[PDB]
Amino acid sequence: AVPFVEDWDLVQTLGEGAYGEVQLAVNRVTEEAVAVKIVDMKRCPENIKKEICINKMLNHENVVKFYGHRREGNIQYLFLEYCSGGELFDRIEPDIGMPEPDAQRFFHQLMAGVVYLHGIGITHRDIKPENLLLDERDNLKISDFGLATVFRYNNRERLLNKMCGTLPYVAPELLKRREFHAEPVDVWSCGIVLTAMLAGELPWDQPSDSCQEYSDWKEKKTYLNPWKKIDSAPLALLHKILVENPSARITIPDIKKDRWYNKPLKKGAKRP
Numbered sequence: 001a002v003p004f005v006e007d008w009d010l011v012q013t014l015g016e017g018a019y020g021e022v023q024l025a026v027n028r029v030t031e032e033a034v035a036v037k038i039v040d041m042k043r044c045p046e047n048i049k050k051e052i053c054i055n056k057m058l059n060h061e062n063v064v065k066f067y068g069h070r071r072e073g074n075i076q077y078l079f080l081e082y083c084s085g086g087e088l089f090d091r092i093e094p095d096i097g098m099p100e101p102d103a104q105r106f107f108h109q110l111m112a113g114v115v116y117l118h119g120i121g122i123t124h125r126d127i128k129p130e131n132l133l134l135d136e137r138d139n140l141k142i143s144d145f146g147l148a149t150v151f152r153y154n155n156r157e158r159l160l161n162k163m164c165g166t167l168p169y170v171a172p173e174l175l176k177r178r179e180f181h182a183e184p185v186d187v188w189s190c191g192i193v194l195t196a197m198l199a200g201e202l203p204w205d206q207p208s209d210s211c212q213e214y215s216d217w218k219e220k221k222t223y224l225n226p227w228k229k230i231d232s233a234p235l236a237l238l239h240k241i242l243v244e245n246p247s248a249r250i251t252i253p254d255i256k257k258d259r260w261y262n263k264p265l266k267k268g269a270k271r272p
């Protein structure tokens with residue numbers, strides 16, 4: 001009905017990437033803001049097609065909302081939820097981290113999103129601060145499903161084998177075994193994100209015996225650089241998440257029962 005509702009203006013560039021760029025778009029009439037992921041297909045047909053399919057089946061408060069997409073020649077346009085607060089990455093002070101109560105709150109929200117995804121059979125495969133966005137009220141939302149895939153269909157689990165992710169956040173089994181369960185891998189990456197939030201640094205370049213940092217952790221030398229800055233309660237949770245054997249690694253239902261996870265720390269928003 002309203003004559004100019006379909007027109008959007010490109011205000012600025014939110015972030016560039018290998019496949020393309022994401023820009024802020026504002027509705028001409030309503031001034032509603034949305035992020036537009038512009039991926040130049042000419043440079044991937046297979047990748048982007050799957051990303052749209054996965055986005056179409058997602059609906060959760062801790063997952064970046066999908067509004068739709070447009071073909072238009074050889075350029076895909078993904079209309080997504082605009083998260084005013086930016087990336088979690090920018091809330092992590094180098095070598096410091098952030099206040100423990102804020103990290104706990106962000107972690108709770110991250111667990112909520114991951115539980116949702118896993119419940120519908122999808123694994124993200126690239127969880128890291130750069131892909132965890134914040135809205136106006138600092139609510140965390142999982143974004144970028146370009147590397148995501150379905151690991152459970154018709155109630156039957158499919159073991160994964162493709163090398164996906166970012167080295168500092170990837171689980172050790174991804175580098176050691178041919179096949180592996182999807183869920184423990186996302187749990188591990190959430191553990192590395194927690195470490196980053198509480199220490200402002202990544203523990204190792206990759207989870208392999210060759211990395212001195214990784215071997216030290218296995219030998220329980222928690223008096224070293226990253227771990228010494230954390231505090232026993234959350235550190236005990238990390239000891240359960242960053243376990244090399246994925247079969248022995250803590251599951252999300254048990255993380256929800258962890259002492260630190262349920263420790264009162266935060267305070268609500270001043271004057272709601």
Ligand SMILES: N#Cc1ccc2c(-c3cc4cc(CN5CCC(CN)CC5)ccc4[nH]3)n[nH]c2c1
Nearest residue numbers: 013014022035080081082083084085086143144
């Ligand atoms: N999939 C996906 C997907 C990727 C990114 C985004 C964003 C996004 C990125 C971003 C970056 C900054 C911080 N910047 C903005 C740019 C400015 C320079 N022009 C410097 C400060 C502030 C707000 C903000 N919001 N919202 N939704 C999605 C979905």
